[PDB]
């Protein structure tokens, strides 16, 4: 999988380290080789939700496969625990859009994963 | 819906407010609660549109159902009408992605829609 | 069609030529007039792939049609070979998200291509 979290959080409220927090855990989550797995972070962002400037974010997870009903519930635990735990965001102020590739639409070194 | 605006426009000149308006237009456009929407707003990009770096926008607006062909357009007036009378951007250097969302794809407060 | 490339090489090293150079090799590769196509470079960001902090992208191409598993395969070579030479970034660690959207879900000048 591929993540990103884009958040009106500030950047110094990024703790050193929640990259890789973020790759390892989604490896367990998803029993993928970390070697494979993106992460991204954008703090500082103007956001709102629902009208309000306190923190939020807003994320993403792209994978091929692994994605579904129980799956995204398990997934949104696990990622607002750690925005929340991380980043002190209220869990009701993410959205994680989940995204399920098909491989040949999927870029990769040269080719596509199909 | 959430909505995203990236644009080349200085951070200056984004209006005071211009958060605001568009949490309060794009509730009364699709009849959902404020409360919900989340709106992301990120000037000073490097972009270009058609190979020229005049002012121009790349939006998404993801919502769970009232996509569609007719709602669709009224959005596009919409929000190029906005970007036009408080960015000075063009609407004819406006893109806007539209995503119709299953809910079972979208995560929020521990959980997901479905 | 529009492309994006989110990446952690820093704003200096993003040479000032490059988004018309993406833009003109694009409108070669898609067989569509340079004036439809957006670019977007976004550097400078806080990413990990496979766990490294080494330049990195993560892009996505959308377009009305021309999307399909040869094509996609083309695309890959060709921005890899972009991404190689003007931004010095391991053709293994970019990913390219390809989308081919409907025309009634891309608005423009306050309307679709609907
Ligand atoms: C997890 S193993 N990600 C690597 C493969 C991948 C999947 C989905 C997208 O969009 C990019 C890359
Ligand atoms: C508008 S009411 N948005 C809140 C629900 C939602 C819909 C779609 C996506 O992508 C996130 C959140
Ligand atoms: C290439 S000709 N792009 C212009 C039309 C277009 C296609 C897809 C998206 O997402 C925006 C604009
Ligand atoms: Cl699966
Ligand atoms: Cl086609």
């Not at 993106?38 to 994978?63: K, N």
């Not at 091929?64 to 991380?86: H, T």
Request: net charge neutral.
């Amino acid at each position: 999988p591929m993540f990103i979290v884009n958040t009106n959080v500030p950047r110094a409220s990024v703790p050193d380290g929640f990259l890789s927090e973020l790759t390892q855990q989604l490896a367990q989550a998803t029993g993928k080789p970390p070697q494979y797995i993106a992460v991204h972070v954008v703090p500082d962002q103007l956001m709102a939700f629902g009208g309000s400037s306190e923190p939020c974010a807003l994320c993403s997870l792209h994978s091929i496969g692994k994605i579904g009903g129980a799956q995204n519930r398990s997934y949104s635990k696990l990622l607002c625990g750690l925005l929340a735990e991380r980043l002190r965001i209220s869990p009701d102020r993410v959205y994680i859009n989940y995204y399920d590739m098909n491989a040949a639409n999927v870029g990769w070194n040269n080719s596509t994963f199909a």
